[PDB]
């Protein structure tokens, strides 16, 4: 169906450790493909997926140059925000930025994004129209007015509807074997007696891609999400994801309960019985 390319950036000031930590990660859908970590030895943008290693060396030189420029912008920004908020040079502070683009099933532009946060709160973000800004407070209002003068939105919109979507399409073709593949969950169910009148049913979904999924327990075809423990979808570490959902039920009523699994890779949702 639809697809996305996303970059995530974190910068954390360290008056104690000198220069701020800076981490950047790039994702197409739920697959990481690049990283830069200022605390790592390489000081380069690094591949994290095999299909991006098809990129020539001008790619890696050029992304390394621009990610180091991103870092310097964020470093200057932490100092600007310290002033805007009248804070002292003592404490550690954090800036977080996310940007990227979505395309539809036709791979045509669908939406663009560019959001910025200071110390874990919304600071400023670009609206859906890619031409105006939502400033979260009075300090961000100054950034909005500055960026309006300099056509910062029109600079970002050119990238988000053009460069961003064309590189996503390129990556989706170059990595067609893995990025365009869906991996349906491997499923099984476990049963544990918690007392001789109650028992835990656990429904498992393993090795699936992308991360989006719905696991639901039903009794007699009626919802039990309220009664269900659902763990957060977690990475397996190999590019796939895991999740489980469990209900505690009366012993001898296990047969009323069904587990339902919906996922992109499943042409029809499946039902698990004990």
């Amino acid at each position: 169906g639809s697809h996305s390319m996303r970059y995530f950036f974190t910068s954390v000031s360290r008056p104690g450790r000198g220069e701020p930590r800076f981490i950047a990660v790039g994702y197409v859908d739920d697959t990481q493909f690049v990283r830069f970590d200022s605390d790592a030895a390489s000081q380069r943008m690094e591949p994290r997926a095999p299909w991006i290693e098809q990129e020539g060396p001008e790619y890696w030189d050029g992304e390394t140059r621009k990610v180091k420029a991103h870092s310097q912008t964020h470093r200057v920004d932490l100092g600007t925000l310290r002033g805007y908020y009248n804070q002292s040079e003592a404490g550690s502070h954090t800036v977080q930025r996310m940007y990227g683009c979505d395309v539809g099933s036709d791979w045509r532009f669908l939406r663009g994004y560019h959001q910025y946060a200071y110390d874990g709160k919304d600071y400023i973000a670009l609206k859906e129209d890619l031409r105006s800004w939502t400033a979260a407070d009075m300090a961000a209002q100054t950034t909005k007015h500055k960026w309006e003068a300099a056509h910062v939105a029109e600079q970002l919109r050119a990238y988000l509807e053009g460069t961003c979507v064309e590189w996503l399409r390129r990556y989706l073709e170059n990595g067609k074997e893995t990025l365009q593949r869906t991996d349906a969950p491997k499923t099984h169910m476990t049963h544990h007696a918690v007392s001789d009148h109650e028992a835990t049913l656990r429904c498992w979904a393993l090795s699936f891609y992308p991360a989006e999924i719905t696991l639901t327990w039903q009794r007699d075809g009626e919802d039990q999400t309220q009664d269900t423990e659902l763990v957060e979808t977690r990475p397996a570490g190999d590019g796939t994801f895991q999740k489980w959902a469990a209900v505690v039920v009366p012993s001898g009523q296990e047969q009323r309960y069904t587990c339902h699994v919906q996922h992109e890779g499943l042409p029809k949702p499946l039902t698990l019985r004990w």
């Binding site: 970059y7 912008t73 200057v76 600079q155």
Partner: peptide, 9 residues
């Protein structure tokens, strides 16, 4: 691919 120039706050 990254944005080519990130503008300062």
């Amino acid at each position: 691919l990254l944005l080519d120039r990130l503008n300062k706050l």
